[PDB]
Amino acid sequence: LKKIAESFEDPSSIVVVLEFILFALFFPTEFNRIKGDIQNVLLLFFSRWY
Amino acid sequence: TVTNEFASRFRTIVATLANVVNERAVQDDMQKATRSCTKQWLRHLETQFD
């Protein structure tokens, strides 16, 4: 996955989270191979809000 | 460590120190826009420390 670096702060930064939820529903085959790191950039999102 | 420890302790400082700031914007009750633009500053301040 082409690294997407950013920090979630504003409630409006949900666009970078919603970008995966949309990508995972068009190409389930391709999302199944890079689910690895697309996980850890989203595991950063879970430390901040919850 | 996945997410650095030292910085995650700082997040607890901001987490509860900001809660104390609200109890002054309830007695001096300023319009949302004012009380918001300060609670938004602590987001930037803390995310720098990371």
Nearest CA-CA partner of B48 in B24, B14, B21, B19: B14
- Cβ–Cβ gap B3/A47 under 8 Å: yes
Nearest Cα residue in chain A from B8: A47
Distance, CA of B23 to CA of B27 (rounded, Å)? 7
One-letter amino acid at A10 equals D
Chain A contact set for B43 (CB, 8 A): 9-10
Place of tokens 């826009």: B33
One-letter amino acid at B37 equals C
Task: Indicate the resolution in Å.
Answer: 3.9
Long-range contacts of A6-14 (CB under 8 A, 24+ apart): A7/A44, A7/A48, A7/B47, A7/B50, A8/A44, A8/A45, A8/A48, A8/A49, A9/A48, A9/B43, A9/B44, A9/B47, A10/B43
Cβ–Cβ under 8 Å, residues B47 and B5: no
Q: Which of B1, B2, B39 to mutate to test the interface with A (most CBs of A within 10 A)?
A: B2
Chain A contact set for B2 (CB, 8 A): 43
Phi, psi of A3 (to 5 degrees): -45, 125
C-alpha dihedral, B45 to B46 to B48 to B50, nearest 10°: 170
3-state helix, strand, coil in chain B (%, to 5): 70, 0, 30
Closest Cα in chain A, distance from residue B19 (Å): 16
State the method: cryo-EM
DSSP class of A42: T
